[PDB]
Design a protein around this ligand. Structure first.
Ligand code: CL
Ligand code: CL
Ligand code: CL
Ligand code: CL
Ligand code: FE
Ligand code: FE
Ligand code: FE
Ligand code: FE
Ligand code: FE
Ligand code: FE
Ligand code: FE
Ligand code: FE
Ligand code: FE
Ligand code: FE
Ligand code: FE
Ligand code: FE
Ligand code: FE
Ligand code: FE
Ligand code: FE
Ligand code: FE
Ligand code: FE
Ligand code: FE
Ligand code: FE
Ligand code: FE
Ligand code: FE
Ligand code: FE
Ligand code: FE
Ligand code: FE
Ligand code: FE
Ligand code: FE
Ligand code: FE
Ligand code: FE
Ligand code: FE
Ligand code: FE
Ligand code: FE
Ligand code: FE
Ligand code: FE
Ligand code: FE
Ligand code: FE
Ligand code: FE
Ligand code: FE
Ligand code: FE
Ligand code: FE
Ligand code: FE
Ligand code: FE
Ligand code: FE
Ligand code: FE
Ligand code: FE
Ligand code: FE
Ligand code: FE
Ligand code: FE
Ligand code: FE
Ligand code: FE
Ligand code: FE
Ligand code: FE
Ligand code: FE
Ligand code: FE
Ligand code: FE
Ligand code: FE
Ligand code: FE
Ligand code: FE
Ligand code: FE
Ligand code: O
Ligand code: O
Ligand code: O
Ligand code: O
Ligand code: O
Ligand code: O
Ligand code: O
Ligand code: O
Ligand code: O
Ligand code: O
Ligand code: O
Ligand code: O
Ligand code: O
Ligand code: O
Ligand code: O
Ligand code: O
Lengths: 169, 169, 169, 169
């Protein structure tokens, strides 16, 4: 058929990466709707996480497309529910988001390493081009948000969270 | 004439609901002008309540129109003056506004129940379509405002009320 | 707070309905990528199911929004993986899609019944307005597709599936 | 001069790759004109292969440009005539086209490997950027075409080839 230079080890890892991105999308959907609760009511934070839910879903879709293009076979698994039901303050959430992104980034790096070992340059380039750069930029932006939240919620935590939501997000 | 499947019990309750919406409109007019006092001076809060005064008056007008359309007879009663002359802080006012809206909502639910009991689907649909959805959305928005006011007026109440008025309303 | 006339029984059922719509979205994502396999290669069928994946996800999002608006609390569960890894012919898939939609429709009808029993007209109207009508139209369209697939794959099944994909989808 | 980190082994392989792409261009020109014969008369298939002849020629031209940019020296060899004079059915041709593309792809992978061994990242990136991705997409598209041709020419081969040409190409 069309499959060429596409190992079963890479195929399986791409399937696992699809699951991790859909899991992340689901986490962001839960973060977003938590900040839209009447008793939380931070619309800018809700909007930030809803946008990330969409981006992670797009990530998954491009991986699946790539899997089909190389002749691998997509296999879906159960998607685990997010690690929490309530996500605390904006500070707590942005910390949980950075931890999540770093674990996706690490999965991307692990797949790139596997691609290198297997001499699969198309895999390596596809990750380089569509995932690694974007993760780095996103992680930087979250770290920046995290620094600003912290400087704000030193004293007067309520006031600080409100101003962050209104003036940054 | 035109009257069909329109009970006297529904007619009377529609008249009472008109009175409650005009009463609410009047309450909002008083809230709005209180926040426009030189010694209160929160223009965004004034504008929010003036807009609600207009919406409640529109509500009353659509009920009256519907009463005429079904062949019932509008009857007006005295409109009671608002429960207060001065409305305290933005926090106090938004609490009084939520209590008001919930009491309108309850009146709408009571009328819907009566409509169901009387087998009056046109009544049920007219409420569904023009009132119940809008009340729910409004109550959510007020609850959100209330949460943000509270998080702001934890410490530094004056500063918090000013920032809410400037950045949310 | 804002919660009014919103039973715990309805809240829980809304949470379960969110899970069913996300489960359906996931099923459609798997149907879509299966038809994009190089060894299946029916782009119109892929596009039809990808669009349904998006619609079901939108469905879930509106339910969550509504849950927040009424003051209920969203709770997410694990999303079960689709019932199959490979979906056979266009005929087999469209049959599996109709069965899925009818099971969503039945869940919507069950929730509407519960809403009626609980005297929750806002719930009843929200379903009426955004879900019941759309499900009916979609089920009709799938039944139409199914009839046309069947008339085509009487004799010359390969030729029939190709023509359906090219001239209908 | 300008030559830096550009091995004679890479230079020679780039020259061989230029020859393979021009050879492929020539094969596609012959495929295209065969389908334009009065006794074959499949215009859409002719147009598909003529477009591929142009793409492969562009491929060769970019390699030559790159050779000049790195300071290597282009050397041309005789271009071998296509492996066949007549190419049979649309099915036979699309099979021969996939085999051709996979042999170009393999040559690209071999050059990338050599580039890696020689620590020549500019070479590796130039291939990544302009050739490897495009080959993968093209091979997927040909595999899709091949699947659709096969499902069509099950029964009624003449009818199937005509419909493919008219509705896909
Ligand atoms: Cl291979
Ligand atoms: Cl009557
Ligand atoms: Cl209640
Ligand atoms: Cl050198
Ligand atoms: Fe909102
Ligand atoms: Fe977006
Ligand atoms: Fe968007
Ligand atoms: Fe958006
Ligand atoms: Fe995006
Ligand atoms: Fe986006
Ligand atoms: Fe992006
Ligand atoms: Fe997008
Ligand atoms: Fe994008
Ligand atoms: Fe594709
Ligand atoms: Fe919880
Ligand atoms: Fe909860
Ligand atoms: Fe690389
Ligand atoms: Fe930045
Ligand atoms: Fe003014
Ligand atoms: Fe207005
Ligand atoms: Fe106005
Ligand atoms: Fe106005
Ligand atoms: Fe209005
Ligand atoms: Fe208005
Ligand atoms: Fe309105
Ligand atoms: Fe108006
Ligand atoms: Fe209006
Ligand atoms: Fe009239
Ligand atoms: Fe007074
Ligand atoms: Fe006074
Ligand atoms: Fe109803
Ligand atoms: Fe809101
Ligand atoms: Fe495609
Ligand atoms: Fe769409
Ligand atoms: Fe779309
Ligand atoms: Fe689309
Ligand atoms: Fe939609
Ligand atoms: Fe859509
Ligand atoms: Fe829709
Ligand atoms: Fe849409
Ligand atoms: Fe829509
Ligand atoms: Fe909202
Ligand atoms: Fe399977
Ligand atoms: Fe499979
Ligand atoms: Fe109803
Ligand atoms: Fe209704
Ligand atoms: Fe139709
Ligand atoms: Fe011609
Ligand atoms: Fe061209
Ligand atoms: Fe051209
Ligand atoms: Fe052209
Ligand atoms: Fe080109
Ligand atoms: Fe071109
Ligand atoms: Fe190109
Ligand atoms: Fe061109
Ligand atoms: Fe080009
Ligand atoms: Fe130059
Ligand atoms: Fe010959
Ligand atoms: Fe000949
Ligand atoms: Fe590389
Ligand atoms: Fe690279
Ligand atoms: Fe394709
Ligand atoms: O909201
Ligand atoms: O978005
Ligand atoms: O996106
Ligand atoms: O994206
Ligand atoms: O004012
Ligand atoms: O207004
Ligand atoms: O209005
Ligand atoms: O309105
Ligand atoms: O595709
Ligand atoms: O779409
Ligand atoms: O949609
Ligand atoms: O929709
Ligand atoms: O032609
Ligand atoms: O072309
Ligand atoms: O091209
Ligand atoms: O190209």
């Amino acid at each position: 058929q069309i499959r060429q230079n596409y190992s079963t080890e890479v195929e399986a890892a791409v399937n696992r990466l699809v699951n991790l991105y859909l899991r992340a999308s689901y986490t962001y959907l839960s973060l977003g709707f938590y900040f839209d609760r009447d008793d939380v009511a931070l619309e800018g934070v809700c909007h930030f996480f809803r946008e990330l839910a969409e981006e992670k879903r797009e990530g998954a879709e491009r991986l699946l497309k790539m899997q089909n293009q190389r002749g691998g076979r997509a296999l879906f698994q159960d998607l685990q529910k997010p690690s929490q039901d309530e996500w605390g303050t904006t500070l707590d959430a942005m910390k949980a988001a950075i931890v999540l992104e770093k674990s996706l980034n690490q999965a991307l790096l692990d797949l790139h390493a596997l691609g290198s070992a297997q001499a699969d340059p198309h895999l390596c380039d596809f990750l380089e081009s569509h995932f690694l750069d974007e993760e780095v930029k996103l992680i930087k932006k979250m770290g920046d948000h995290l620094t600003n939240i912290q400087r704000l919620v030193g004293s007067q935590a309520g006031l600080g969270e409100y101003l962050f939501e209104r003036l940054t997000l």
